[PDB]
Amino acid sequence: MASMQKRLQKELLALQNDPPPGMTLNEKSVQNSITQWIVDMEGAPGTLYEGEKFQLLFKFSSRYPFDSPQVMFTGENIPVHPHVYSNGHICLSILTEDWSPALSVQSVCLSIISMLSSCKEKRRPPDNSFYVRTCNKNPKKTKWWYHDDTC
């Protein structure tokens, strides 16, 4: 058994001892008085991000690891990518529908690395009737949307 903070201490030490090649974990003390981590990500060899560094922001909840961290690109370099928005938003299933307590900060970073390495497109069953019939298991339509306009 482990608490939210205990889980993060475990994860922290795992990544301080041996983070993935090209990755560095730096816990950031913040004015928000919550746990937020900064990750140094150098792009992998052979990709279009190779040699460039991008930063990640991991915002942890008290529910964590039973509620995924908000994970976004930050720093002064947001990568141009179909699943990366200019405001830092990262579109990965690992942060939503595929999140599980058995996962890790490391595996999220690795998911992001493989995202940048090979962009995957979305698909659905060829049986469109079937697809429509399974849409009752999908999230409901969002009305209010977050905007990037200056306030």
UniProtKB/Swiss-Prot annotation:
Annotated CDD domains: UBCc_UBE2W
A single GO BP: antiviral innate immune response
One cellular component (GO) term of this entry: nucleus
Cross-link (Peptide (Met-Gly) (interchain with G-Cter in ubiquitin)): 1
Pfam families, per database record: UQ_con (PF00179)
Effect annotated for changing residue 144 to E: Loss of ubiquitination activity toward various substrates, including POLR2H, ATXN3, STUB1 and MAPT
GO molecular function: ATP binding; ubiquitin conjugating enzyme activity; ubiquitin protein ligase binding; ubiquitin-protein transferase activity
Domain UBC core: 3-151
Entry-linked Gene3D superfamilies: Ubiquitin Conjugating Enzyme
Residues at the active site: 91 (glycyl thioester intermediate)
InterPro entries: Ub_conjugating_enzyme, UBQ-conjugat_E2_core, UBQ-conjugating_enzyme/RWD
Subcellular location: Nucleus
EC number: 2.3.2.23, 2.3.2.25
Presence of keyword Nucleus: yes
Expression across tissues: Widely expressed, with highest expression in brain, liver, pancreas and heart.
Keyword tags: ATP-binding, DNA damage, DNA repair, Nucleotide-binding, Nucleus, Transferase, Ubl conjugation, Ubl conjugation pathway
Mod. after translation: Autoubiquitinated at Met-1.
Reaction(s) catalysed (UniProt annotation): S-ubiquitinyl-[E1 ubiquitin-activating enzyme]-L-cysteine + [E2 ubiquitin-conjugating enzyme]-L-cysteine = [E1 ubiquitin-activating enzyme]-L-cysteine + S-ubiquitinyl-[E2 ubiquitin-conjugating enzyme]-L-cysteine; S-ubiquitinyl-[E1 ubiquitin-activating enzyme]-L-cysteine + [acceptor protein]-N-terminal-amino acid = [E1 ubiquitin-activating enzyme]-L-cysteine + N-terminal-ubiquitinyl-[acceptor protein]
The protein's annotated pathway: Protein modification; protein ubiquitination
Subunit structure: Homodimer. Interacts with FANCL. Interacts with STUB1/CHIP.
Task performed by this protein: Accepts ubiquitin from the E1 complex and catalyzes its covalent attachment to other proteins. Specifically monoubiquitinates the N-terminus of various substrates, including ATXN3, MAPT/TAU, POLR2H/RPB8 and STUB1/CHIP, by recognizing backbone atoms of disordered N-termini. Involved in degradation of misfolded chaperone substrates by mediating monoubiquitination of STUB1/CHIP, leading to recruitment of ATXN3 to monoubiquitinated STUB1/CHIP, and restriction of the length of ubiquitin chain attached to STUB1/CHIP substrates by ATXN3.
Family stated for the protein in its record: Belongs to the ubiquitin-conjugating enzyme family.
Protein name per Swiss-Prot or TrEMBL: Ubiquitin-conjugating enzyme E2 W
Organism of origin: Homo sapiens
Gene responsible for this protein: UBE2W
